[PDB]
Amino acid sequence: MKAGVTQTPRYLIKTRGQQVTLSCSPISGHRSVSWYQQTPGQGLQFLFEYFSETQRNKGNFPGRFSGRQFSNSRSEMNVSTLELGDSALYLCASSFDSGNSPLHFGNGTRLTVTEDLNKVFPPEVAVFEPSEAEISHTQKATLVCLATGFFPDHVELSWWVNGKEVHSGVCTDPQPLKEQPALNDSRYSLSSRLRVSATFWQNPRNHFRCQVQFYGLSENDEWTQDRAKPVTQIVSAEAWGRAD
């Protein structure tokens, strides 16, 4: 299995005025590398495209957004003097030739710019065991996982049954809800369901885990609040089946 477009880092939290440098490696054989900013309000917007170490095309961003490409076709972009509205998914695309060949995108760098790192919180995670009425009426059993109170929205939720990742019987909300819809710094909540047969739930040897990866502060970020520093971490909750 060949590598697709790769981007590093995956997630960043910065305060206003700071700077970031992002990297992208194209698919092997692709020489055109393009950067785009995706925001809720403006959608995808073109930054610039590089080929053979030189910028070939550019969008309409101000000069604090910059880029470069190395001889192996890897590209970096940099943003200086960061502001809240620079929060975005920074997407890289590679192509053999952007004029006549498809764009292949990476999965982006998610950047959140905040006023203050004391706005950052990890999720609390809980599993809720199935209703006995559901079990008797349907012979199925739905577990719910809630990930709540987090900021920013830098989470990945997954389910694991006896140590193996499951997708069958799962549905996770496509986006989180703001707990305080009116506020720019609102914390978020996310729900997911895992449904199994009643027979499978009734076996006490079956182990269920809801895993939430949260991408938070760096070891180099200062922290002087009483609460635990909200570093990158996994927060999990679990249940076992039960006969009765």
Binding site: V5, S34, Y36, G43, L44, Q45, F46, E49, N57, G59, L91, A93, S98, G99, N100, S101, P102, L103, H104, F105, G106, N107, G108, E124, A126, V127, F128, E129, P130, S131, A133, E134, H137, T138, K140, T142, V144, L146, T148, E156, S168, G169, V170, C171, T172, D173, P174, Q175, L177, E179, S189, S191, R193, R195, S197, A237
Partner: protein, 202 residues
Amino acid sequence: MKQEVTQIPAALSVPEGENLVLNCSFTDSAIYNLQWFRQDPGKGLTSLLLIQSSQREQTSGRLNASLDKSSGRSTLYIAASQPGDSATYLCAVTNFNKFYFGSGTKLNVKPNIQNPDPAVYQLRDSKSSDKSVCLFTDFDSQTNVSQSKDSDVYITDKCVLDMRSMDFKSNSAVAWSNKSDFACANAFNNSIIPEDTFFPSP
């Protein structure tokens, strides 16, 4: 002249099995190519079709798109829609020295629920959590889930899970709160729910 790319509809939500039409329009006809992409939530984009400025259409499986360059139009046809088609669909054009993306069509393809069994269940209390949780489940895809009147009651939208080895799909919405005057009997009161919805005793 200034390129503007428009896509309609902004959002489309249809029953599986129906054909779909996605429209794109561009004001500047001097383009090198037009591309269609899909994007899932929390992911990057996937190229579906690339139509060169000299070509009138491209086809891949159930997808066919036309290009009418002089008219400034492309239409993407998706035959026989499937739940796995649900995504945002983006139109982009490559101009002489610029690249422009439309704002997207957000497509939701709903399952046909074979045997609706609408119910609201109370899930067990968590000894680590102080929230109470209610599950509205097994309703047909015509049901719309509304937000609560109450700002401290949280309600998701319908989410479809697929139990593939059982040939079974189901819709559900989750409601929760940590207020004390909250119960599952009342949780979905701001939604129009089926009259036959099962509310088990506690």
